[model samples]
Target: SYRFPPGFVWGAATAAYQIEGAAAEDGRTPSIWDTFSHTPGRVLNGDTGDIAADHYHRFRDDVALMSDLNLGAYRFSVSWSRVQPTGRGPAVQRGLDFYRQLVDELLEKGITPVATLYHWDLPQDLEDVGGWTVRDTPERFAEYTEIVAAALGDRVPYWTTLNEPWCSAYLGYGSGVHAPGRTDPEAALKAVHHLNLAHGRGIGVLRSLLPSTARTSITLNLHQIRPLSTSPADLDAARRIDAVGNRVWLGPILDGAYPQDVLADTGHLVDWDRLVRDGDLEEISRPIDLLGINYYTPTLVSDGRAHSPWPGSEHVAFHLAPGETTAMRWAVDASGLYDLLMRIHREHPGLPMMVTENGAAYDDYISPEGAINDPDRIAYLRGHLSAVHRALADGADVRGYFLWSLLDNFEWAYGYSKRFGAVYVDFGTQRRIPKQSAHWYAAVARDNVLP
Candidate 1:
């Protein structure tokens, strides 16, 4: 039996664009995701987040689902465009009211509301003006943070400024696999720096506006990198991949400096002096109450491909870890979770950590009786949660765990093709059927232990 610490948070996580619909209502405008998903040929099946799970209308029911599961917290993101339609000036009252109602409902249900300010849904207008490549976006992010903090600061104590900036910078800008897609390497590097600045600026804004006890953190999808071979070339490839994939953001935010290897790799593409401004590191080094880690699979790299998702390492190939895999083609390696936690603990101990997002996308389906049976996902949850328990036993100061998703909503570029949810959602009817894994997770939450 593995028991989590008493009162440890156990909850489900969802992003605004992935789950919340009503995109343009009540002065709400288009986000980068809105623009990209709506663009022809950008999204698979031409799917958009226009009515994703209809969460905007069904959040109360979702809160009921949380209460039924004995959730201690509910980790969700606030749509920037929803709150501040244009990402500047005053917040739309109706937009603020939606979140206000959400926070109150969660509190009434005895669930803590953990609010994330940005989750890659930048306003379309902002992206057209240069997105994160522009330094002014950091200032805009700070302004948006202040507006949100002023409104929800009293009720929401936990705040995460940004979520998985790696995907935002590299996948979106470097590989052009995501929204507001651009394949410019220099712009990708610039976007990384600006995202760091936004996190720091947002933290500064929160500190100025929120209560002293409020918890401020950033969620990073840190990679646990491995080399395909022990050869020096392979080792160097791993190092380069780590530099761009993980250290690019971690270096400045945690250590107040970019990794030397990262700078060396991108030297030809960017002027280091202009890339990072003076006092930039200090701003990014603001003290954080916790660090959120999102892990899914281990990245194995070797020199091969000409156009790599990694900015500077275009010749490196990402190898899927050998063994069993889920429906997403990502390896089912729970040990990667342990390795990531232990490594972060070794590098930056004493800081509390959380499994901000961890789950798998499996081909799931419901039975005729309206019950969803997903053995693969249940086993996946069991293994990963056990990994968290093991990490805690091994001296990692992990505080809690939030599953990757609460419902099967839009899944980025894959659109609705992949399902990574505890609750199976029927897109046509918008009906949610809690799978067996959901019941299994609910039990874990109720007992505060893994059996």
Candidate 2:
């Protein structure tokens, strides 16, 4: 058993579109996900978050489940389409009521509410014009943020402006792997700046609306880069990929400048100076209260000949680490989490950090005895939490750890094919079943120890 610091917040997280599946209810409109999922072949089996887990109607029961699990915090995202509908006008009061009720329910259950403003669900109306690619989208995002903050700003303590902008910028625009899929390299490059600009603007808006004690942060799936060899070529490959994988967001958001080498690498694509306009970095690098990190795997790369998922970093080739993998074929390595924490601690010494999202999808099913037994998931959490403990002991300013999800719900392009929740959701019946890992995590949260 390993003891964690006292008062360390233990919780679970879920995105709006991923779990709250009341897609067309109350004033809710279409987000990029709605358009993408309905696009005949975009999502697997044509599955969308439309009726994913029905959390919108059953959040009260879910809050009870969190109390049962001894969760100290609950990280959930606000649905932009639901709240602001068109992403430009005043928010729909009916939409604001849902989050108002959700937050009240969390407080009633004694669980801290950590609200994420955006989680890859750009409003379809905005996308039709040009989502994230254009500056106008981020400008509207700030307007949307103002509405949500005014609605629930008084109660929510932790505020994350965006969850994983890397995915929003790169996957959504670069590789066409996520919603509002577009493969134009220039759009992807623009997305990077615009998303960061959105965060900067959102943070400024949140500060203007919320109580001064309120905290602000953003979640990033910062890749833990590793070279296949120690040779010069491999070293530069890591550097190039790191520039793409980490520094793109890290530089502008934290340091007030995009990495010069990364600009040199991608300059032929667009003018970086103009793309990241005047006063953008000042808004971006404004000191935040926390850095939320979501890591499920490491980045293994070598020198390459045009291998790329990201637009500018084509000279780097990615490789899968050899090991047992999750159902997603993502490597099950926890050391990467440890290395990533320490690396950030070393690089960005003073900023507090949180393991905002870390979980794996596994092939799970109800047992003959009608119990959801998931030992593999428990083992995974143990390894990763232990890694977090190691980093904390090494003096990283890690504040809390939130499991990836509370309910098994829509998994983006994979749809319902994978289960990553500590709680088992029978999507058909909307029945909630706490998996074996939930019981395991309940004990961990209750005792503040890795048991």
Candidate 3:
């Protein structure tokens, strides 16, 4: 009978590009995603988000679905291009109207609207002009932040500045696995700093516009790192991955400075002195109300010959920690979640935290009775939720948990192949059938207990 704390928020998360299609509507221009997904052989199954789940038009029903799930909050991102077409100047009120309507609908249904300003949908124009690697992008992000904050601040109580900037900066630029796919280690490092600047500047904008009671945060897919062995080489490998994967953002955002070791390690790839200008750290270190942590699995690394996501540390090799894997091939280990929460609580004592995005992708299908039964997803959620409960018992101040997605939509480069949603979406018919996991989650949300 594991129970969560009273007032703990329970919600489902979705990204604008992932679900809210209407790719070219209401004066909304092309985002990097629009371009990337359109490029030949970019996304799997040649799927583009041209009409993803049609959420842009079906949001009313979606909100009603949230009501059925007893959701307390909905953590959703706004397409930067949708609201501010070119990532600059006045916002398209028509685009803002969608979110305004969505927020109103959630409120009408007694659900909290948690708005995320950026979720990798960088306006194509911005990407064409250096994107996150340039200082101008952060300046433009602040402008866009003000535009959004002014429009939705009165109705939305919680705002997230960015979702997984690490992926946006590293995967997008470093590894070339995501949008605007450019593999430049230096560019990736530069994007990291600019993203930090944007988050800080965006926080400042939210502070100035939102009510005093409103809370602002940034969602980081912080890696739960582990070394394959206790050997010094393996430990060093883990440290390097941690520096780039986790501390790159956490160091500045929380501790007000970049980790010295990270700088020394990556010094050859990028000149930190040239990339980070005066007063950048101050802006990047601005205080945030809460920390939004997204964890999927633990990152196991060992000293090896080749292949690395860490820019300068190619000697580190990532491995699976021997467990059942999700459809994404990510190992499923609830203990990773427990360990991550404890580590954060120990390092950043008293800082409120939330599991902003946690859930698994499974090869789910509709059963003969017209029901979607995702037992794997259900087990995944139960284990992770139990992990969260364990963390709270150990004094980790986790205030909320939002399932990875509300509906299955375009999964970035994976396209529509991956299913991570509690509510199953038939891409062909655009029909949504809530899986058994959804009902299970509703019970959890309503009772604040694992069932």
Candidate maximizing lDDT: 3
| Model 3 clashing residue pairs (backbone) | none
- The TM-score values for the models, in the order shown, are 0.98, 0.98, 0.99
Clashes per candidate, residues 3 or more apart or on different chains: 0, 0, 0
Report the lDDT tens digits of candidate 3 across residue range 29-121. 999989999998888978898899899999999999999999999999999999998888898999999999999999999999999999999
Better of 1 and 3 by lDDT: 3
Count residue pairs with overlapping backbones in model 3.
0
Off by over 4 Å in 3: 306-308
Error of 3 at 191 (Å): 0.2
Give per-residue CA lDDT, model 2, range 125-202, as digits (tens): 999988888889888988999898988999999999999888888788888989688887788889989988999998
Any idea what lDDT model 3 has? Answer: 0.92
Q: In candidate 1, how many Å is residue 129 off?
A: 1.0
**The 10-residue segment with the lowest total lDDT in model 1:** 303-312
- Per-residue alpha-carbon lDDT of model 1 for 287-331, expressed as tens digits? 999999999988888867543467778888778898679888999
Clashes of 1: 0
- Candidates arranged by lDDT, highest first: 3, 2, 1
